[PDB]
Design a protein around this ligand. Structure first.
Ligand SMILES: *[C@@H]1O[C@H](CO[C@@H]2O[C@@H](C)[C@@H](O)[C@@H](O)[C@@H]2O)[C@@H](O[C@@H]2O[C@H](CO)[C@@H](O)[C@H](O)[C@H]2NC(C)=O)[C@H](O)[C@H]1NC(C)=O
Ligand SMILES: *[C@@H]1O[C@H](CO[C@@H]2O[C@@H](C)[C@@H](O)[C@@H](O)[C@@H]2O)[C@@H](O[C@@H]2O[C@H](CO)[C@@H](O)[C@H](O)[C@H]2NC(C)=O)[C@H](O)[C@H]1NC(C)=O
Ligand SMILES: *[C@@H]1O[C@H](CO[C@@H]2O[C@@H](C)[C@@H](O)[C@@H](O)[C@@H]2O)[C@@H](O[C@@H]2O[C@H](CO)[C@@H](O)[C@H](O)[C@H]2NC(C)=O)[C@H](O)[C@H]1NC(C)=O
Ligand SMILES: *[C@@H]1O[C@H](CO)[C@@H](O[C@@H]2O[C@H](CO)[C@@H](O)[C@H](O)[C@H]2NC(C)=O)[C@H](O)[C@H]1NC(C)=O
Ligand SMILES: *[C@@H]1O[C@H](CO)[C@@H](O[C@@H]2O[C@H](CO)[C@@H](O)[C@H](O)[C@H]2NC(C)=O)[C@H](O)[C@H]1NC(C)=O
Ligand SMILES: *[C@@H]1O[C@H](CO)[C@@H](O[C@@H]2O[C@H](CO)[C@@H](O)[C@H](O)[C@H]2NC(C)=O)[C@H](O)[C@H]1NC(C)=O
Ligand SMILES: *[C@@H]1O[C@H](CO)[C@@H](O)[C@H](O)[C@H]1NC(C)=O
Ligand SMILES: *[C@@H]1O[C@H](CO)[C@@H](O)[C@H](O)[C@H]1NC(C)=O
Ligand SMILES: *[C@@H]1O[C@H](CO)[C@@H](O)[C@H](O)[C@H]1NC(C)=O
Lengths: 323, 166, 323, 166, 166, 323
């Protein structure tokens, strides 16, 4: 008569590593690194991504007329910007604090485009266009958000000024530019005055600009340049503008609700998906159950920490050693 | 029949640890549900602590820098690189450490069950062998089932005393 | 005859968590998270806080005449700035590198106010005042640290220049401003010249400013603006200033000893205490014996690390299982 | 009277581990001071290591940023968030691990004390029961105190030999 | 001659754990090569995991800042200071923890070797003493070498039965 | 007859610490903190350091004529800049974005100096010199990389312009300056025009400058100042410059291959070595076998992590307790 104490063995082929042994067979394990991903850009808690295939973020903000992009009023949780997108600032020149501007547009809990000025009311000729900024239909055009003012015909450009009061439900992003013609003849034909002062001011902003005449290298047909700028008009504040030439004046601003978090994905080949996820990595969506993931170091949402390991198997059962 | 010293049992399908007895009525193999449940609860806790104490609150976007912001670009990358080295090392070492402890915990649970039965049997059995007691008396399937559920006394004290001098 | 081996049980109600078990009774424990705090701002090793109830840091630096705040020669270990403090830059306009300026004023092992120029000696009329900058007594006044110069009467403003040599025991913070009047008539009555050049130079600093005339939105009665600036005059260096108008000229600088560490606490309801601490968190003072604390992620001094946990009980004694 | 297998002793107030004997003169309960002091010294070391290796040198102020410094604001926040996650997880897991080991260390210290007494007692006692030896000779209060302070030989070898065949 | 209970052997030079026997032919001291090799393999793995899982990919240069970049200067310093505190504490505690476990693992390998020999000897030896078996039969030098290489039966079962009632 | 189980003791004097015990003797240990270093700056995988004993990085870049320094075509893996190096910007004034410039020069997989312009072709007098910028031989000289243009004799300075196209195998760093004379007489004798416009433009860069006349504090004999600037001309791009005075014009640019990593070592007394290493710390070279090192928190290459500990001994053998 005999009684024996024992433990279970099974047909598991699982192994784990321990601090003192490699590849120990065990009766059951569980994986701690999430390695499976849905290779697409999905909705998150904040909603749907905005895809930019042909336009850079700057182009849609300033409203490059080749940029059809529909920004919807629901807003967007993040921006997928294809690196191959050709259209940027159609009239050559660069945006001051460009990375910060892209940052403020990367998320929006909702979106509203606001008219700041009507240049009917101004003693200038309005809505100049350029072959550098062709519309998608074909003719020459200009940015939608800023308005190219030149001298009232036949030859007058006095100081013009106007004011906009932010009575809206948020902070407004507004945009402007300053044209630097390539020579004094072009300066006088466009603006009459050989030198001009353009001021953009708010309750807190105090900025002034004068043109620097001269030829720059040819870019997209142009030896002139624009410097582009942007600002934030807080609730209740006043935006005043004043110019006797060279100001590319603010016409449409943007009311974005929510804070921004720099959610910009610079990716060519992963598509927009029809899917929802708690965790969106830059390489695809993943479950967030496990404590680690090896999809990507960049991610949004409620995400496990990134590790560059193929697996981290935790022993659950026994050392698998049959009799 | 042998116990745990000579390896694991593929027969046992209802638990991690248990009992194999042989008397004249034949043999019985059953899991000890009480020592199995304890171990399962413990390993469940361990797994839940490792998985659930991790925070899934903070986001890591890819920030953009101008060509005259090289220094802050590198500082940003340094945060990501050094934090990642910390997680990579601690997560590997945690799993290696805990995997070693889990397999030792199983071995120790088995030996705890063995020692719980040697204390109930006392002088009525020779502890000799291989995770196995040789019982010195009449112990049928209802005596067996009392060695397993714990409700077993030293009734048999001198039936074995005779069997032990032989 | 019998001898038994045993272990102690007691009346402890302490429990701990272990990796494998919840709420195990144990005969003795110790707490690792400091959860008790004295809800006050105390002295630290570097001394006493400076409380700013009515004035922002910028206002006391530039010397808003409503800010009587006593800056002590002992200095201060950190600044508690009440978010509700109403007084800022009384004459409208903004401080270039404002956050860096506040940073340099946030600690001082000692403090000395230094006169840099006496504008008696200058061919201008000195000490202009404004209703935007009323004194606490009631009349119109101006900043204490910078001096509003206007044309010598009846109508002369030639280039004036002066020099100050830093012969003091360290680096001097100095301040200045540039006034932008709303119209050419105000420009001419204040400064005579229709356009002016103001230069602020040191051995290393080379800065020049010209006014941009034009109306900005009304703020505190004013359609003009000032741009405010600041600099550091290192030991032995020379500060030269030159202007034929629009310079709000430096009059008093600050000699702060010690390095600064950005110790600014932006808090409304925690009072200044009469207490000393090695560890001052932004939510109150704490003992630093334990390795962790859950008072605040922001703190100064010799502090345990922040964890957002209610408790971390370490087992010391035995599993409490009486027979 | 029972030993550690049947649970802890509320009577013992002068230490963590010790002895409960019963002879014709009555019973005695005292702590073993040498196994207790060892264990206290060890747990003290553990606690001092966990508390004292923490550095309390660096400060965490709330930095200020303009409205066109959103990126460096987020980078600053990322350092604090990721560092805080590392400390939250490691400090929880450290304490959970070390609490499990401390309680195991106490069980193992007790078992060590028992085994040190079984080796001194040898054939002179039956190891049977519940953390308790049944001694086969007359062991008065001065024999007892020699089983406890280690100063005990097997003088008695043949007084037990007869009592054991009984 | 005494076993491990009474301390370590300066004689043993060919391994970590082993055997010391005494019969009428004299005495023999040899390492057990298979329990030593096991232990060396395990400690080697432990050392390789602690050393080799560390990443040596990222660089820490001393960045430069102007006097109006005090804030990012401090943010850069905060990354380095906080990361260094994490490594200082985790590396100290890792080594302290693993050093305690390594010394316990050696103790446990010795007791595993002892218990493997008590199971081979069975009723043929009295387990009494000091890490040492007293064998109840004549065990010459090839009886010994079979207790050590595992190839040992209970041939002798009844030569001991007689010696044990003596 | 008797068989005993035992373990080895030896003559080791090694001890370790464990979580529960101080200074336990053990039969063998291993050290985890690398504490030995070769106190010299060696070659790394990227090659040899550049040592700067007498010149700061800005000085060799702008080509202070006292800086004989050999820039080799192999390039350099890092820069050791002696803090005592006396020579900086010889003509007084400061470099915009100085830290970013030093950063881009700190490593180079190879190096090429490129001529951007020949001022033979220009209607100006070229190659002005100054006593502030003496050659090492002794006479007055000037920077090698930028060229002091003044009016063509006897008195003409019209707008001059020129173009350089980057046809080289990468991005070119170019340099320029703007001279601010101390008074209007010096302005007219050097440049004829009382006010000037200097434009430096590329496909993407659009910058213009005007001089601000006035005396600054005496530095190295000078009451005038230069502002120094720099830019990046990308592959294929055009650099256009235009000036009627005050431009210190770009003459030599630099083609550096490789990315830079801020490898600047600011150290006085550690010498350049004749040695190779995988891991170069700022305190000397070290083996990288062990996981930690206490040489320095700053390092380059494939390096163990820094810990400020004298030792971390891991137990390998047994508790050393002989019988
Ligand atoms: C901007 O558009 C002009 C306009 O092109 C033509 O007019 C439109 C109505 C439409 O029918 C287009 O398809 C036509 O090509 C472009 O200017 C012409 O460019 C071509 C191609 O290089 C050239 O041969 C002609 O000389 C240009 N014609 C004129 C009148 O300038 C121009 O290419 C577009 N610019 C950009 C940057 O896309
Ligand atoms: C700045 O102070 C002026 C002056 O206020 C008055 O004069 C002082 C001597 C003192 O007695 C004050 O209490 C007086 O109120 C303020 O200007 C007056 O403001 C009131 C209230 O809005 C208004 O009715 C009057 O028209 C103003 N009078 C004049 C002469 O301008 C002004 O409000 C203060 N400015 C700020 C920003 O606080
Ligand atoms: C720049 O160099 C001048 C040149 O000085 C002299 O001329 C050379 C050809 C050579 O032979 C030098 O050794 C000569 O000293 C320096 O100007 C002289 O400086 C000395 C010392 O202060 C002074 O006594 C003289 O007056 C200066 N002579 C002239 C003609 O100005 C000058 O010091 C050098 N500048 C710097 C910043 O080092
Ligand atoms: C992320 O984890 C996955 C899962 O292990 C890895 O994908 C495997 O990669 C291994 C090694 O390259 C291959 O043998 C398999 O083909 C892959 N398996 C599957 C199911 O795809 C992946 O390599 C890991 N990536 C990183 C960066 O660690
Ligand atoms: C910090 O720790 C303290 C101590 O546990 C917490 O204060 C307790 O909070 C619990 C949970 O809400 C309450 O039951 C008690 O009212 C509090 N106790 C005391 C003594 O005040 C506090 O919540 C913790 N805070 C954080 C952010 O972790
Ligand atoms: C780096 O580690 C080394 C190695 O221990 C330390 O150098 C020793 O320092 C101890 C303690 O101060 C002294 O007893 C010896 O003089 C040193 N030995 C040698 C060989 O130099 C050094 O102090 C450590 N430095 C830091 C910052 O941790
Ligand atoms: C247009 O000109 C008239 C001229 O008196 C002026 O009153 C008006 O303000 C001008 N409009 C703008 C927008 O400046
Ligand atoms: C005041 O004017 C006289 C005019 O000759 C001049 O010498 C002096 O330097 C001027 N004062 C200042 C401060 O410029
Ligand atoms: C020099 O002057 C002549 C004037 O006809 C002009 O053509 C040429 O472009 C000028 N050189 C430069 C570099 O501007």
């Amino acid at each position: 008569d005999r009684i024996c104490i024992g433990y279970q063995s099974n047909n598991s082929t699982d192994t784990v590593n321990t601090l003192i042994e490699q590849n120990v067979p065990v009766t059951q394990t569980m994986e701690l690194v999430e390695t499976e991903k849905h290779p697409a850009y999905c909705n998150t808690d904040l909603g749907a991504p905005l895809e930019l295939r042909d336009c850079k973020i700057e182009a849609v903000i300033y409203g490059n007329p080749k940029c059809d992009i529909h920004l919807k009023d629901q807003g967007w949780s993040y921006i997928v910007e294809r690196p191959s997108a050709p259209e940027g600032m159609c009239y050559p020149g660069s945006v001051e604090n460009l990375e910060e501007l892209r940052f403020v547009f990367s998320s929006a809990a909702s979106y509203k485009r606001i008219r700041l000025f009507d240049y009917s009311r101004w003693n200038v000729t309005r809505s100049g266009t350029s072959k550098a900024c062709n519309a998608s239909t074909g003719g020459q055009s200009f940015y939608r958000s800023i308005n190219w003012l030149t001298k009232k015909k036949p030859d007058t450009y006095d100081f013009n000024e106007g004011a906009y009061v932010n009575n809206e439900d948020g902070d407004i992003i507004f945009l402007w530019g300053i044209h630097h013609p390539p020579d004094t003849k072009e300066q006088t034909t466009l603006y009459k005055n050989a030198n001009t002062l353009s001021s953009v001011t708010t309750n807190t902003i105090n900025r002034s600009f004068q043109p620097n005449i001269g030829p720059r290298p040819l870019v997209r047909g142009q030896q002139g340049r624009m410097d582009y700028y942007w600002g934030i008009l807080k609730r209740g504040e006043t935006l005043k503008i004043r110019t006797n030439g060279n100001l590319i004046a603010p016409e449409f601003g943007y009311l974005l609700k929510g804070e921004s978090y720099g959610r910009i994905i610079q990716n060519e080949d992963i598509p927009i998906g029809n899917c929802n996820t708690k965790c969106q990595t830059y390489a695809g969506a993943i479950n967030s159950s496990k404590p680690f993931q090896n999809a990507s170091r960049h991610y949004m949402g409620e995400c496990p920490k990134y590790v560059k390991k193929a697996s981290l198997r935790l022993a659950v059962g026994l050392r698998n050693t049959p009799s | 029949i042998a116990g745990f010293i000579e390896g694991g049992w593929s027969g046992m399908i209802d638990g991690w640890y248990g009992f194999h007895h042989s008397n004249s009525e034949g043999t019985g193999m059953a899991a000890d549900q009480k020592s199995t449940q304890e171990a399962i609860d413990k390993i469940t806790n361990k797994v839940n602590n490792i998985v659930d104490k991790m925070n899934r609150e903070f986001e890591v976007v890819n920030h953009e820098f101008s060509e005259v912001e090289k220094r802050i670009n590198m500082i940003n990358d340094k945060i990501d690189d050094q934090i990642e080295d910390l997680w990579a090392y601690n997560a590997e070492l945690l799993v290696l450490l805990e995997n070693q402890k889990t397999l030792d915990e199983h071995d120790s649970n088995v030996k705890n069950l063995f020692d719980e039965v040697k204390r109930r049997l006392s002088a009525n059995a020779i502890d000799a062998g291989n995770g196995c007691f040789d019982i010195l008396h009449k112990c049928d399937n209802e005596c067996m089932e009392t060695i397993k559920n714990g409700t077993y006394d030293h009734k048999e004290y001198e039936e074995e005393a005779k069997l032990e001098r032989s």
